[PDB]
From a paper:
We recently characterized two novel HSL family esterases from the thermophilic fungus [name]: RmEstA and RmEstB. The physiological substrates of RmEstA and RmEstB detected in our studies have been found to be short-chain triacylglycerol, linalyl acetate, and butyl butyrate. Both of these enzymes belong to the α/β hydrolases and exhibit distinct substrate specificities: RmEstA shows highest activity toward longer-chain esters, whereas RmEstB favors hydrolysis of shorter-chain esters. The three-dimensional structures of two HSL esterases from [name], RmEstA and RmEstB, were determined. Both of the esterases were composed of a core catalytic domain and a cap domain, exhibiting the typical α/β-hydrolase fold. A classical catalytic triad consisting of Ser161 (Ser164 in RmEstB) as the nucleophile, His292 (His291 in RmEstB) as the proton acceptor/donor, and Asp262 (Asp261 in RmEstB) as the residue stabilizing the His was identified in RmEstA (RmEstB).
The crystal structures of RmEstA and RmEstB were determined at 2.41 Å and 2.27 Å resolutions, respectively. The triclinic space group of RmEstA was P1 with two monomers in the asymmetric unit. Amino acid residues 1–3 of RmEstA and the uncleaved C-terminal His-tag were not visible on the electron-density map. In the asymmetric unit, RmEstA formed a dimer in complex with three sulfates, and two of the sulfates interacted with two monomers via Arg104. Note that the third single sulfate was found in the crevice of two monomers, with four Arg residues from two monomers forming an arched area. The side chains of His292 and Asp262 in RmEstA were stabilized by a network of hydrogen bonds located at the carboxyl edge of β-strands 7 and 8, respectively. The substrate-binding pocket of RmEstA was a channel running through the whole protein and the entrance to this channel was surrounded by five α-helices (α1, α2, α6, α8, and α9), the 310-helix G2 (His197–Lys199) and the loop regions (His87–Gly90 and Ile291–Ala298). On the other hand, the substrate-binding pocket of RmEstA is a curved tunnel which can accommodate ester substrates with long acyl chains. RmEstA can hydrolyze esters of longer carbon chain lengths (up to C16), with the highest activity observed for C6 (15), whereas RmEstB favors the hydrolysis of esters with shorter carbon chain lengths, with highest activity observed for C2 (16). A structural comparison of RmEstA and RmEstB suggested that the differences in the substrate-binding pocket might make a marked contribution to their distinct substrate specificities.
Numbering used by the authors:
A (entry chain A), B (entry chain B): 4 to 323
Write the structure that this text describes.
Amino acid sequence: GNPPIHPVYAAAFAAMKERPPIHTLDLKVVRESSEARQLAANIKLPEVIEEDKVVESDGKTLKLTIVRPPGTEDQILPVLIFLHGGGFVFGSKYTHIKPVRDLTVKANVVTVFVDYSLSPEAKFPTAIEEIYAAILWVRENASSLNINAEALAVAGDSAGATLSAAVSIYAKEKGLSAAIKTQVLIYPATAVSHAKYESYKLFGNGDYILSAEDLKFFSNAYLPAPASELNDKLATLELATKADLEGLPPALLFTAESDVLRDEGEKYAQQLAEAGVDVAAVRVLGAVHGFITVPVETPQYRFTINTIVAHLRDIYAKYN
Amino acid sequence: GNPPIHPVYAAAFAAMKERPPIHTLDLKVVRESSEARQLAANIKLPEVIEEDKVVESDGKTLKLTIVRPPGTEDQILPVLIFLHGGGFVFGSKYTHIKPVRDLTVKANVVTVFVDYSLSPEAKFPTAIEEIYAAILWVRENASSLNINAEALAVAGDSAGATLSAAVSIYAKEKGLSAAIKTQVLIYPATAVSHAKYESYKLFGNGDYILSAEDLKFFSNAYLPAPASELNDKLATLELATKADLEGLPPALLFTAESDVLRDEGEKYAQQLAEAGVDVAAVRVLGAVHGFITVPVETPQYRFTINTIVAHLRDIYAKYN
């Protein structure tokens, strides 16, 4: 309830302690709401070739961003489906620009960024259905995207990690069980009830970046009913049966040491292994929730990027 | 005291637990202790070029094994100093043949395996002094070994991890503080008293691979006096001051979830970060003490090898 955190994370929270709770803000705090604050960061970014597209698939209209390294336009690449965090309420290609551009050039892939519908304007399960539809589209247009559509991965942070895990189950229930070759899950949310876990108590009182109070706001925005009445594993992953999880694609899971969602994340890792799924799971020491989008580099930001890149290249090599 | 472990590790424990105990064996249990029982595993290994040498350095005589990938003999490579585990009492190039050959070929390096003096025939601090002398020898003969001696790292498991960390401090106190560019530490032992940490209680009662009874055997074998009377940081890393740890090289530390040494390993990570050292540290879920030398591959063995390879190549690149 009290180990040390890296000074960069401590400095970032202290600046945040001044602000009002979230339910008392105009949701066009999306604009400042670090599109602006992240541009002000001034951080180093690697050169990239970026392109936006608007398409139709499986009965939906989608917006996508396609990101590729320089000098690879004529080369056929593996593909990464990236799902951003933000509590289901915020986030865009501007807020997550640093980890997306880093993964793309270091792994040497084509990244498809899915700009899914945000809550509370949309609710469960619209985004899961959009992400399934985008996956179908990428398989249909591999030749025009210059990718090997069989070498495919899904990866995301926070709420994006929750979506990566659910669309892996959804795709299987639709008869598409061989499409996704790996799932990368960076501090996901999984629980019907969070107060069951010790980390909720230790880090949820408002002195760390993601509070028990913040969590209650995001759940109400995302869910169309209370989780206990909803009783749906695609909404709350913790409910998944051994049968639900059997045959899922190999997983890589990260958890943060000082994070209310820590223990429920580690419990889902255990659930996947019981069902026979290949799982590599680690707890990262000194880190807090959301650290992959923190602009000032730390030893754990660098470790996590490099470690994901090596896992992706290990998986992709089996399909070339 | 009760999370799940991988089925492979449970199987390995029952096979080891059925065998006669340690303090009731002739120390020429060395021939059978996974020189034969390893060979006998007959697992696939990758091709390598191996060479043994006997040399003089800093007033000592050393035995070394030098390992390199095929087709790189004329290319100048970075170098990895490797220190095997075994409680300070067992271990050789036959017991650790699998991770040494994997690291060598995947990272594309020259591995120098240091066959240090075993306990109880030798005691603290003889082995530490031998490893410093080998580091000096590697630096003297870089042109004859075909390596860039500046791009140098030290890595080890269990007791080999304890040795990696101590020789990083020893070398610094000798005025050789720029020689080691990174330390890789796989479940090390650090404590004066182990019973201060909760993981000693949870996993030390004889139902896991490294018991409190086993630990007591190795300490009495290695130490010339009790740790509390010795009061020496190079013997028990936990005693190290902030002043001792300043200016040390960047660390990668692995800890195992079901392992008596878990909490004291995680404490040493905190100590290094407090002193300003760059540290990436993780807890590996589902794993037990000693897992890097288990022959049957697990998702955790693969993750750990690939992740070390990605860290070594990150460090080496800034020196070429």
